[PDB]
Paper text:
Cyclophilins are peptidyl-prolyl cis/trans isomerases (PPIase) that catalyse the interconversion of the two energetically preferred conformers (cis and trans) of the planar peptide bond preceding an internal proline residue. CypD is localized in the matrix of the mitochondria and acts as a key regulator of the opening of the mitochondrial permeability transition pore (mPTP), which plays a major role in calcium efflux from mitochondria to the cytosol and can lead to mitochondrial swelling and cell death. Cyclophilins adopt an eight-stranded anti-parallel P-barrel structure. Their PPIase catalytic groove is formed by a mixture of hydrophobic, aromatic and polar residues, including Arg55, Phe60, Met61, Gln63, Asn102, Phe113, Trp121, Leu122 and His126. The existence of a deep pocket contiguous to the canonical catalytic site, called the ‘gatekeeper' pocket, has been revealed.
Author numbering: 44 to 207
The structure:
Amino acid sequence: GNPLVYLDVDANGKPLGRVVLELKADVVPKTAENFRALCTGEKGFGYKGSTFHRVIPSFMCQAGDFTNHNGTGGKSIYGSRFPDENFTLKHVGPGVLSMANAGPNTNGSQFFICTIKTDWLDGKHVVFGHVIEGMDVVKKIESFGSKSGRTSKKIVITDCGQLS
């Protein structure tokens, strides 16, 4: 079946708990595989030790810039960037997992977890999974964001990996 992966998240060195994500490899296999491998770190790089660098209450929590830690970086297991696979899955509600980008066909490693229905991103960002467990952790992360995106605590993915 579809991969299940996890992110364990700290805020100022205090554990918040675990976010478990289903990756919809049935719909977006290339996009799912990138995220899966970045969670395991099996290519020699990935999300472990990196941060949620942009968090906006009543919108989303963004992470995945494991090279520059500020929204300008990241890379995929395929190369620097890869195409929008499809827009079949929609931003239907809280818990949706979707690729951050800098316009069409600029997926790398950055991603966001929605805390509301972000319907205006449909057709612009590739949705590739959702939160199976740990919305409480996501809401804690959200509570440390601000309107500007700047976080009030350092939010770190201390561990990550594949469950199945």
